[PDB]
Symmetry: D2
Subunit: 242 residues, 4 copies
């Protein structure tokens, strides 16, 4: 998370950390608890190539990474069939836990938006995670969960910005319909924030608008962060998630 501040213990109960086995259970991606047995993340975290489920654990909401680890095994990874690279869409994945979680007030699920919600610019949105604090700068110990308010951008404005200082034809779409844009040069998500949720408060409810997907660097000029648009994939999500 580029910009923002440390998140209070009360906020973001649906935030999850994905761990990979090595010299320790290392954080590599974020995710959101969308159902007591289902985690929504980004496909580029776990795909396109198949990984060993044994080398993967899930950690639910914790203020400081690695301090009070209670790691949960995963029974299934479901990656969108249309996925190969993050920039070309379908950057969405589901992880099914071995067992469902006993949801408390400190740890509970996020609401997915209704199919009609567009999330227009000027929407109050937050992105949370334990990713890089800047370009090639890791989040320093004790690894607090960070939060940043990000400005939503109209897809066509963002697509135009991505064409500035690029050789790509103006008629060729860089930012697509299954994507969402947010952030500026002070506020953005970074590496290790992928899969993490972009949440907006709509009608007094916290809905998950997007999943951290990609961008050209972190908080670079004319390169806002691109998120997978959750509304676009609700049918696919609901084919597995109740």
């Amino acid at each position: 998370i580029v910009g923002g501040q440390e998140a209070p213990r009360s906020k973001w109960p649906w935030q999850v950390s994905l761990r990979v086995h090595g010299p320790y259970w290392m954080h590599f991606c974020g995710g959101s608890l969308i159902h007591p047995q289902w985690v929504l993340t980004a496909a580029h975290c776990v795909g396109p190539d198949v990984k060993d489920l044994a080398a993967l654990r899930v950690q639910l909401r914790e203020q400081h990474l690695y301090y009070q680890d209670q790691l949960l095994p995963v029974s299934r990874i479901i990656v969108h069939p249309q996925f190969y690279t993050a920039q070309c869409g379908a950057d969405i994945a589901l992880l099914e836990l071995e067992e469902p979680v006993n949801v408390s007030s400190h740890v509970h699920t996020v609401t997915l938006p209704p199919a009609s919600e567009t999330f227009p610019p000027g929407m109050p949105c937050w992105v949370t995670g334990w990713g890089d604090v800047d370009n090639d700068e890791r989040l320093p110990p004790p690894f607090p969960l960070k939060q940043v308010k990000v400005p939503i951008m109209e897809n066509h404005i963002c697509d135009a910005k991505y064409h500035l200082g690029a050789y790509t034809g103006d008629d060729v779409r860089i930012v697509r319909d299954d994507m969402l844009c947010a952030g500026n040069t002070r506020r953005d998500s970074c590496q290790g924030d992928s899969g993490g949720p972009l949440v907006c408060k709509v009608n007094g409810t916290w809905l998950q608008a997007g999943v951290v997907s990609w961008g050209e660097g972190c908080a670079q000029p004319n390169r806002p962060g691109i998120y997978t648009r959750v509304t676009y994939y609700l049918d696919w999500i609901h084919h597995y998630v109740p």
Copy 2:
């Protein structure tokens, strides 16, 4: 280059090294001399974002990198308009040299294939370059130009191989029509070989079949190297480069 051997001084006169300015004029990509003023390379080398032409030089065929440098400036970089990421196609770009080259027997152009040439499996093809010798293993000094004979694979076989041990739906194409497949677990191109030519001897002539583009690792099982299919982009190439 994974596998193969050091190339003799006589072979591959069209091979070029692209250099980027830093503490030295560092090799980052390969390319091929297709016309005395034009270099054919991969778009992911120079794009999608526009770079300063001043920080880019071209080095023609040399046996050992950096030892006898005669660096040439570039007046134009033309990246295919449909390009953004290597895996999603249009990974092709042209570089116009500020001055034409005096083509000798040791340094001369490669012939582009006729639009109809398909390059079927069992074709004798070579890939050349100064890229990594293995995964995360740089080519050691004195940096000799390497060559490897690579087996051509049918696109459908190759698209099927890329689906093995992948979550991508079988009905979703990974290897597109503007792409070509070559190599195995012993023979492949690697990082720093991009833009480099895949040449095949057809009817006693050396034709450039492809441009080193992408792959999952280097010489990994069921992951052959993916090249940009030159035939697919001839019309775009010939919009800038003279036919004759």
Copy 3:
């Protein structure tokens, strides 16, 4: 630490962590609280060249590095005047804290040994710290304080071991009288463990025998860890630190 295990919360109350300012207050050395306003460390941590006292803080006994930081400023660094390189001796330093600490049961001082204590082989000794877990392998998060029981070796035996597979003349001392040897191929201290205490239980008391100083690699054959012998420097220590 190479070998051993995570230390229980009750053990080693005198263990300290030295912090250097950067993107965060990073651990670079250990030390021991020998008096409520004095920390005993290794000179190679802070010298031979003078550093800014402002970029240095001290953290007292904590189970996991960085999680519950209460960083203390330092008013003075006193490096032994003979010191230049770790291998050539005098690898000892004192840090004076701006204010003394309120010593609890969880955080209190270590006893320095009497001048006569030799620490013979077969002594039960421990080395503690947050250093590397192996050669070029950092201690992984949540950075627990590690402990290892190390076998003491006689100086003449150890100097002989250091001459095996070395060009140095047999008559030339590598392991000097101001040094102590401990550890094997399974048990040793490593990089980031320097300054850290080597403690032995003698007559029901915990005495600091040494300070982590140097060695050839971590847990290598015929290369035990070399510690600064605290008894050798008691007069210098007591010139600044109250007994």
Copy 4:
């Protein structure tokens, strides 16, 4: 080499490169050909611990590293018996080539100084090598041999400079009689230049004054480069190398 320029093909015929086996025969140290079968280098290159002679080769004077390699095996490594660390003296070693070299005009030996030569300040001295071009900055391809003219400094001036911004007692000798000082903030030797010769033109002859040994960083203020004084070790050299 920090500062200076690429050396012409005619200059420094005695310069050698020491190679270690790995993914390629990599340059790690410099040296000088003092006799057709003998290379003079620094002991910290090859010691204090004994290495496998099989994994070590010698390359004679070449303009660009790795281009036209003609690697020579080594039969014997003789490290000064008093050596353990570079800063504490005796940083000198000899390599005996498996067979003597056919000395040409482009590749020949350097003249060792007479025992009486002191090399006073204001002497025109050069240091050559393929070491780092700055702190943590490797020499870029095609790896040309570099050369830099370095100002000689009196040992007492040097020792005093090494005490500025250091905790070491003023009466504690850091720079000793078996050492020589040269260089400033623009001109110095660096990592990978060790073993490399410091040559001075005296009475129309090129004499090897020193061997690149140590320093605090490269071209840092009040930290000139320390070289092993060849005159100090002539008796030891001549015990193995013919006059």
